[model samples]
Target: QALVIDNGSGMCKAGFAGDDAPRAVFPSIVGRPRHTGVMVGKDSYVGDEAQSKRGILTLKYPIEHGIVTNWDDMEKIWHHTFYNELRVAPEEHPVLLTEAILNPKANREKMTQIMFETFNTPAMYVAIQAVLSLYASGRTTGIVMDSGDGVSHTVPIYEGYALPHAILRLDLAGRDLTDYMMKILTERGYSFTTTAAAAIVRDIKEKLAYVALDFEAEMQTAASSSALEKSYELPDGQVITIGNERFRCPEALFQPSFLGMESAGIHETTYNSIMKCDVDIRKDLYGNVVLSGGTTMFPGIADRMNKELTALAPSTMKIKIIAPPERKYSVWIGGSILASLSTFQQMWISKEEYDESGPSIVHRKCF
Candidate 1:
C-alpha cells in the first residue's frame, strides 16, 4: 500500500494512494488541556477532536509554513491518523509527502528520521507542494500561486521541478483575512471569546468574502448602495450584516499595505516571481499560472489575477490563471495521482536506502 499525505499547516490530507481524494482530511492541530499534565483517558485530542475542544484548551500546530516544528505533536497527529482515521498500519506502506518550497534541509532530515525510526515506514518520497499542484492541473510547467490559511507561496516550476531561486513567498493569507474580518466585526461592536466564536469568523470569511475585479470602482458603487450587504444569522440567532467588509478584507491580497504588510500583492508576487526566472520559460510561467489552496477560492479571484497580471506583464505574453474546481485540495490530490503512477516506482527511497545513506538520502533522492 502507498499512503499520501499533504502535511499542511492548516489541514492534513491523508489517504491511501490511487484514491481520487484524501479519505481523511483534518485540521493539523492538536489540543491539550489548558490545565496541563495528563488527565485520565482522552488527555489530548487531534484534528476535529481538537477543534471541538474550544475553551479550557490550548491548540498546537504540528507544521508551520510546511516545516514541522512540533515533532511530538506531528507524531501524535500521525499516530491518530494511522490508527484511528485510516485504520491502517504504517509499516506496511510506503509514503509520499508534500512540503512547502524553501523547506530547510535539517527539517527534511528530522521528518525522514521520524518516518523511518519512529513509525518504521518502509519507504518515503517528498516533493515540493507547488510542483505536485501543477501535476494536479495536468501541467508540467507553471507558476503555482498557493495561498492557504497560513500564508501564500508563488513557486515557478518547469519540467516538474521548482526553481528555488525564483520562488516568491507572501507572508499573509486566510489567517490574516480572518483576523481582519474579526476587526471589522469588532468595530461593529461585536464580541467573541470562545474558539468556537473564532470558527464563526472564519466561516464568515469563506461564505461572504470575495475579490473585487475593480476594487476602487466597487468601493465607489458600495458607498451609495446598501444592496452589497447581506445578513448572516449567528448560531445564537444574532444577525450580523456583512457589507463592504466582504470584499474589503481580501483586498489585502492585491494591496498588502492595506493589511499593514510591507510585502507586495499576490499578483505582483506572481509577476515578479516569473520575472526572476529565465526569459525562456517566462511565457510558460505566465500562461499556465495555477491557483491552489483555500484562500484562492474567493469569487472573481482568477479574473482579478488575470487583470492585474496583465497590467504588470509585458507585451507578447498572455497571462493565464487556472483554478481547478478541486484546487482547494489540489496538492494532496496531486500527491495521490502521482504516487499511483508506475513511473513513481523509481522515486521512492526504500528503507534499505535509508540504512545505506541515512537522513541525507531524502535530500539527494527527492531533490
Candidate 2:
C-alpha cells in the first residue's frame, strides 16, 4: 500500500496506511525575504519553531487556484511536511498524491517530474478519480461539491464514474466570499484591510451567510431593518450590522455579477449540470445530492440547498441532501479509506511511465 496525499490549496492534508484521518497538515503559504527572490516553506524555521523568520516578508501562499503554479518555490515549502510525515527516505515506497479535477496537463507533468527527481519514488498518482471512487465506496450517487479556499467544483457522478461533461465550477469559494465582504466594507467607509477583514468575514460568513432560495423575499426581509436581522457579534469579539439586504456577497455563487463575472445560481448550476446528462442518470442523481465542503457547514445551508434543489429538480426525484456528520473531514475520511487499500498499488503511475508518456498521460493512466 502507498500513502494518499491531498494537496489542497487551504492545507496540505496527508497520511499513511489508510489511517482514517490526515496525519499532518499546514497552511499552504510560504514566507520570503523582500530584497531576495529566494523563498522557502517549513524549512524556513527559526529557533525551534517551523516558521519563517521575523521581519522577512512572507509569501501568503505557495499554491494558488488549486494548481501548484509556483513549483520551484513550493518544492521547498512542500518538502519538510511532506517528507517528514511519510517517514520514507528516497527509494522507499511509492506515493499516491491528489491533484485537482481537470488540472492543467502541464501542471500534472511537472508534479510527476519533481517527485521523481527529488524523492526518487517508484510511482505517482493523481487523485481526481479517487474522489468519485470514494463517493461510490460510500454508496453515494449524486453530486460531490468541493468548496475549498479558491474554487468550488460540483462533480456529478452516475453509475460510479465521473460525468465529465456535467462537471461545473464557480470561481467563487471561501476566499471570494471573504474578499466580497472586505470590499463591501471598504466601499462603505470602513478601513478593514484584507488581512484583518478576512478574519471577520470568515466568522460572519459561517454565522450570517446563507443561500437565499427566494432572493426577493430574502432581500425584503433584510431591508425591513427588523431586529431579527440586526448586527451580531463576529467571531473576533466585535459586532457589525448586516441588514439582510444585499446578495452582493451571498449571490456570488449563484450569479457572480457583483464581480462582473457571469455565473449560475448554485441551484441553477446544479440543475443544469444534472439535466445535461442522460435522462436515465437523473433518476439516481437527484435524491442523493450529497453536500460536501466547508461552506456547506453553514447552519441554514442544508435547508437552503434542499429548498432550492427541491424546486428545480423533477418532482419525481426524492431530493435527499446529506452532509458528512463532520463536514470538514468528509473528503479526508474518503481519502483515508482510499490510501489504506492494498489495491492502491493499482492506481499509482510510476516515474518510469511519466518519463515515457508525460503528464498528459496522468488522465489516461489513472482512470
Candidate 3:
C-alpha cells in the first residue's frame, strides 16, 4: 500500500455504473442567478456552462465539506451528469455512489430518496471512499490516507470494513505549504494576496519544494547553498524563487508544530490510527498503507512516509507503502470491477427494499 497525487482540474468524478474510468470529471457546484436557482436537462448551466458563467450566475455547491447539502441544487448537478456525460437514463440502470468515511444518517436517506425518487433509478448502493479506494488498490485490509487542501484523513480498513474508531484527521497538507511558500516570498518583499498570484507560488512549490530525509542537515546545507537556489520565470517577467521554503513548507507534514498546530505529524497520525486498531489487524494495516488525493502527490511523499513510519513501526514486520500508476482513477476502477461481479449484483438495495423499508433502509442495507 502507498500513495501519490496529481493536482487536477476538478475534484468530483462522474460516470456510469460499470465504467473502467469516469467519462466525466466535473465540479461539484450548481448555478443559479446572482440571486435565484433550475429546469433540469432542458438547459441549465451545469458543469462547463456554470463555471463559464460564474460572474453572471452565482455558483453553489450542493456538495461541500465532503457531504451533500442542498437537495434542489444536487438534482441539477446530476441532471447534466446523466444526460450530457454518460448518456444513460437513471431509470434503466442500477446506481452506486460514494460518501466520506463519516456520513450523517439523514444524508444517506436524502441520497437514497433522490437516487430512486428523483433520478428514478431501479436500485442504488452507497459505498465509503476509504473501503472503495482500498478495494481498488488490491487490498481488503489496509490503511487509506487521502489529503487535499490540507484536510487529510487516515482510515484503517479490515477486510473492506473501515474502523471509524481508529480513523484519523490531520490539518497539515498541501494547502498549508502553499501559504508557507507565499509567506516566505512575501518576506522577500513580493506581494501575493490574490488567488491568481497564489497559484504562481503554488506552482513554484510543486516544481521545487520537497521534503527532507535529514531536516537539520538539509537546513544547514540550504542556508549556505546558493547553487541549490531554484527560480521560475513567468511569461509576464515575474520571477518566483525558493530558498529554505523548499523543504520548510513540506516539513510541516512531518512536524505540525512548524505550522503552529499541536496535533502530531501526518506520520504520527498514521501510527496512532494503526495503534488504535485491534492488535490482530495492526500489522496488516501497516503492511498496506494506501493513499489518495492530490495533497499526497508531492515528489518525496511516499518516500518520506515510508521513512518516518518505518521508525515508528515494529522492526520485525515489513512495512510497505504503495503508489500505483492507475491509482488516480482507482475508485471508478474499483466500482467498475465490483459492479461486474455476480455477488455484487446481490448487494444493491432493490426498489422493493426501498419501498418496503423507505429511505432509512440505505442506512442498514448498503455496505
Against the true structure, whose lDDT is highest?
Answer: 1
Q: Residue 290 CA error for candidate 3 (Å)?
A: 1.1
The model with the greater TM-score, 2 or 3, is 3
- Find the candidate with the highest TM-score and give its number: 1
lDDT of 3 by residue, 73-153 (tens): 777767767777667777788777777768788988998898788878887788777677788888999998876553678
Q: Cα RMSD to native, each candidate?
A: 1.5, 4.1, 4.7
- Which 10 consecutive residues of model 3 have the lowest summed lDDT? 1-10
lDDT of each: 0.88, 0.66, 0.74
Clashing residue pairs in candidate 2 (N, C-alpha, C atoms within 3 angstroms):
41-77, 254-265
Q: What is the lDDT of residue 257 in candidate 3?
A: 82
| Total clashes for model 1 | 0
User: Residues 257-312, candidate 1, lDDT per residue (tens digit)?
Assistant: 88788999999999899989999999999999999999999998999999999888
- TM-score per prediction, in order, is 0.96, 0.81, 0.84
Candidate 2, 1-367: lDDT as tens digits: 5666667666677676457666776656655555554554323431113243435655556567677778766676547555555555645666666676777878877777777877677877666632633453375467776677777777787655677888887767778777886677667555664344566666666667666667777777666756545475754567667655234466666667876777776667778878888988786667767666665565556666778888887676787676665655566667666656678767778777877876666768765
